[PDB]
């Protein structure tokens, strides 16, 4: 059997990477996995890194479809040793508890039991659910909360940046601009007054005081001074 | 015995979606599932998407009814091979651990054991409890709390909108005319002062400082300014 | 056979400790464990002190690779006693459920079954993920939050210092010149006004009021006095 | 013989894309290709996309090493023998003109001819040459020349951006910022004269006059007026 | 064994012409070519006119995939009397050197060698590459450079219009409304000063002298007089 190829698998991973779960993922998945055995589909589903929530939702959808297939299709009374083989099971359709030889026998035995397209349909339903009910996160979406200390915001920003797929110089550029840009006015005013060319430690030291009694007293007194 | 038809099942899903478990769901369910086997009723109950809490309550009601049936009806002394078949069980009545062939045999064997009507009665009791003690959520119900960051409210609003059943243009209009409308006066004042035709990022940035050391000082100073 | 030596293992531990999980860790691990059996690799990994999160990530990666190997490679139909031995398994590749004699036989039986290099590849993938997606903690990173009580910050600082790898005199110097330095301005002002040569007790008992009604009233009154 | 797994190959592609032929690829390549077939090494080298100059340099180095191997190692008559194995040729170590069966035979028949290790050495030399010489091209490196039309600069910027590995939102943000931030002083000042949020077509229409006789006369007249 | 219907081919041409190479071509191409013999796929790829660069990238992708298939799959020198069908090669899958009868036999063999799906996967990979890295050139993108003579720009615009896909009246309207609009301010000023509704030859004569010595001196004098 013609198993999956490294080029096609890597192209599938790349198209998942560039477009996180845009509606263009389903046509590419349906095009790159024609005739693929459930083992190959599981390989393409496991190879993609990141998007843990989307993968969890897809696995939940696959489990639901397997359970429904189990409910609808019962178990045969007795196996036939000569010229017969075990009927497919929902987990076997999902490829969890089945071997590649058994899947090949299913796809070859006449009349065909096309487990491949059934598993592909389940995965496509999961992908549709992901497309409808999932929004990917990005470094652009990391903004400091109204009452979030600067250190925790910076930690979240750097965690997202590390998880983000970009070149090192691009990541450094984002660190240079977005981190200062995405901040509440309380921290942004202090950062602007700090001046350009200030390292991370200086900014952390400067914004360590936001939300404390001293900063609150200072801003309140400044507000009364401006009003009167 | 023929199974359920796709048209009737799709109409059931549509009526559940439109009435949102209104008191009119019970008549439609009783009308569309006349003579339905427990497998058909299980498909009827599982096909409807959304309303996770209501489905959970229905499942708890079914489990309680099955447990009560198990308690009231004991286990027979022993099976009889010639001209007899296994007596029903609460899980088997609910169709979880029974095959369609066994259910058909139960409905056919004289005197007719009414598995379908018993399961329908249990599901109807569950639906009654759902109607009495459940209120569906909608995008209209999503309002920002008195002390909530604008980002968290926006995230909840968009999650509800994604879960909401509406056309894309309707969803866009709801986003345009509801996000600003449903907000605390502190955020709504800033949004109104922003001016018509503002992007989501601009509004999010403008309301980042709400409920912060700088904002709470400015509003208090303005308050004493107005008073004195 | 020629098992691991105390010198190589100690050098591996030392380089891991001194460089943290830097990108330079992967080359050294690829040089100090040439031909190492999976038990030797497990000994190399286990002796790493600290870095619990990194070791957990490495173990998760190893488990994922073992599961994928189990999925891809099926179970043989029947064992053969004369001139044969059990085929490797993902857990056996990881060395969890295998003996040293079995691994040596695997590496010796012709054609060779490279259990050692497969396990090394899995560990290297885990190390790469650690390098990409992990930031080691240090005493320099311990700073007190804007609303954190001084006692809690001191406790965290001393816990990190105890976990830190340094000589006793250097640790004492770190305590002397870092605890006061890394604090919010509210506590730093009090500590500076305290004067040099004050032990931990006076510093802790002089910063017990930060965040209390008395301090939040005194600083506010001072702010109004300065403004007006 | 064990083949290259899709997971390790995808990880190799990912690390090559991430580090962008930094020194860190040199260890990792040797880490993931232990005992790898020269066909597996060829797949590893072919799968990585982009960096055409780097791959050309690597192929040139491989061809040079193959030519040197051909020069140093002479041909032989190769009579029919019980081993009936032909001596390898530089192309065979390169993997271009060698099938997998004879390749495993070379790696297995006593004495073992390590075609895989020789090909790994050649690829390592090529990678070292790439690290020393080749420099990656980034979107930040795109800067409009002193006398370059704005349309050509925009075309080059978008051509480089479409090959950049980043999320779509990140690419849109790059288009928003870097396109105007990197410009000729005349083009930059004309764009700054335009209000923010202008569309790309408007910006190109405004900059179409840069470098023409009218623009030259205008700037000369303004300079003469300013100085005198 | 049936060929592709002319209506399907015409619809494929229409869909590939209407939306250029927007991602939506990838799904449609999958649907119209399901079960298609590689000769039919070659006909579909050859019939579509325009976008020569896209066709070049496509053909490069099929060539690369065929080369990889050739490398991975070796050649069997000795023919086999039972099932006397030659194993498909890299060019055989693409249909360049394979006849219709051989492809039909390959898709009807036992076991089936699916040349059609492999070829379609190659074209789909090429189409994804086109979508990522190709921007179609339209008449709206034809703008005359700052130093471009008007005759050369007119020739380029007319070449693009002749290559444009639109009705003759639409072409005339685009010529009338776009030639004057898309020009540098230096020539657009002269064209606007010329009487509206002028012949192409008159416009070319009027703006032929732009960028020359006399025009440069005239604009220099005008600017210096306006300044003073």
Short mmCIF file of C-alpha atoms in Angstrom, two decimals, chain E residues 2-4 29 33-46 62 88-107 113-123:
data_model
loop_
_atom_site.label_atom_id
_atom_site.label_comp_id
_atom_site.label_asym_id
_atom_site.label_seq_id
_atom_site.Cartn_x
_atom_site.Cartn_y
_atom_site.Cartn_z
CA UNK E 2 -14.75 7.21 -19.19
CA UNK E 3 -12.99 10.47 -20.03
CA UNK E 4 -13.77 13.94 -18.65
CA UNK E 29 -10.30 21.04 -8.58
CA UNK E 33 -11.26 15.57 -10.98
CA UNK E 34 -12.35 12.83 -8.58
CA UNK E 35 -11.44 9.46 -10.07
CA UNK E 36 -9.86 11.19 -13.06
CA UNK E 37 -7.18 9.43 -15.07
CA UNK E 38 -3.82 11.28 -15.04
CA UNK E 39 -4.29 11.98 -18.76
CA UNK E 40 -7.49 13.84 -17.88
CA UNK E 41 -5.63 15.81 -15.21
CA UNK E 42 -2.95 16.69 -17.76
CA UNK E 43 -5.66 17.86 -20.16
CA UNK E 44 -7.23 19.98 -17.41
CA UNK E 45 -3.87 21.57 -16.59
CA UNK E 46 -2.97 22.17 -20.24
CA UNK E 62 5.08 18.08 -10.36
CA UNK E 88 4.75 3.26 -12.58
CA UNK E 89 7.68 5.66 -12.62
CA UNK E 90 7.94 9.34 -11.77
CA UNK E 91 6.98 10.44 -15.28
CA UNK E 92 4.39 7.66 -15.65
CA UNK E 93 2.29 9.04 -12.79
CA UNK E 94 2.37 12.51 -14.34
CA UNK E 95 1.23 10.99 -17.65
CA UNK E 96 4.11 12.46 -19.67
CA UNK E 97 5.29 9.06 -20.96
CA UNK E 98 2.34 6.85 -19.95
CA UNK E 99 -0.49 5.95 -22.31
CA UNK E 100 -4.18 5.85 -21.39
CA UNK E 101 -4.31 2.04 -21.50
CA UNK E 102 -1.46 1.64 -19.00
CA UNK E 103 -3.04 4.12 -16.57
CA UNK E 104 -6.42 2.39 -16.87
CA UNK E 105 -4.75 -0.95 -16.15
CA UNK E 106 -2.94 0.55 -13.16
CA UNK E 107 -6.18 1.90 -11.69
CA UNK E 113 -2.04 1.14 -8.09
CA UNK E 114 -3.77 4.55 -7.78
CA UNK E 115 -1.83 6.74 -10.19
CA UNK E 116 -4.74 9.18 -10.36
CA UNK E 117 -4.85 10.08 -6.68
CA UNK E 118 -1.05 10.38 -6.45
CA UNK E 119 -0.97 12.71 -9.45
CA UNK E 120 -3.89 14.73 -8.07
CA UNK E 121 -2.03 15.04 -4.76
CA UNK E 122 0.97 16.40 -6.66
CA UNK E 123 -1.17 18.97 -8.50
#
